[PDB]
Amino acid sequence: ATKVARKS
Amino acid sequence: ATKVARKS
Amino acid sequence: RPRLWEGQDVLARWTDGLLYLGTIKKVDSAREVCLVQFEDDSQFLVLWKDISPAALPGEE
Amino acid sequence: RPRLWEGQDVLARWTDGLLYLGTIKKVDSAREVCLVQFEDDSQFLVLWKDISPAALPGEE
C-alpha cells in the first residue's frame, strides 16, 4: 500500500 | 475496494 | 512506534461506506479511536480499525 | 461505461510517490490521461494507470 497525503 | 470521496 | 499519530494524513471510512481524507488531531489509545479532522474542518471520533495511513489502489 | 469520468473523485499517484485525493476535470482516452484537480486547486495531467476511484485501506 501507498501512503496518502494532503497538499501542503 | 472502497470508493474515495471529497466532502460535498 | 504507533501506527497512527497527531498530524498524520489518513483515509477514514465514513458512515456512508466511503473513504474520506483527513488529518489526525488526537490519538486515544485506551479507546482505540482518533479525532480526525476532514477537508470541511469537521471533526469526528473514528475507530482505529477504520483509519488507514496508506491505501492500495483497486477496483470494486 | 468508462471507469473514469468528469466530476469523479479519485486518488492520484504524485511524483513524490504519495497518493493525493482529487477530482477528474477532463478525460482524454486517446492519450489515456486525465486532468485532475487537487485540493489546492492545482490541475495536472495524470496517466489513467495512476488514477483510482477506489482503494483498499492498508499498511505500506
Per-residue buried b or exposed e for A1-8, using 16+ beta carbons within 10 Å of the residue's own CB: bbbbbbee
Handedness of CA A1, C23, C20, D13 (dihedral sign): negative
B8 to chain C, minimum CA–CA distance in Å? 8
Residues with Cβ within 8 Å of D45's Cβ and at least 6 positions away in sequence, in order, are D28, D33, D34, D35, D36
Cβ-contact D4, D54 below 8 angstroms: no
User: Which of C54, A7, C50, B8 has the alpha carbon at shortest distance from D21?
Assistant: A7
Collect all residues of chain A within an 8 Å Cβ-Cβ radius of residue C55: 1-2, 4
Look up residue C9 and give its three cell numbers.
494524513
Residue C12 Cα to chain centre, angstroms = 4
Residue A7 contacts C where some CB pair is shorter than 8 Å: no
CA distance B2 to chain D (A): 5
In chain D, how many domains are there? 1
Phi, psi for C42 (deg, rounded to 5): -70, 155
Residue C17 has its nearest CB partner, among B2, B6, B7, at B2
Can you give the residue range of the structural domain that contains C33? 1-58
> B7 and chain D: CB distance < 8 Å anywhere?
no
Task: Name subunits touching C (3+ CB pairs < 8 A).
Answer: A, B, D
Whether the CA torsion C3, C6, C7, C9 is positive or negative: it is positive
**Grid coordinates representing C55?**
491505501
Residue (of D57, A1, C21) closest to B2 by Cα position: D57
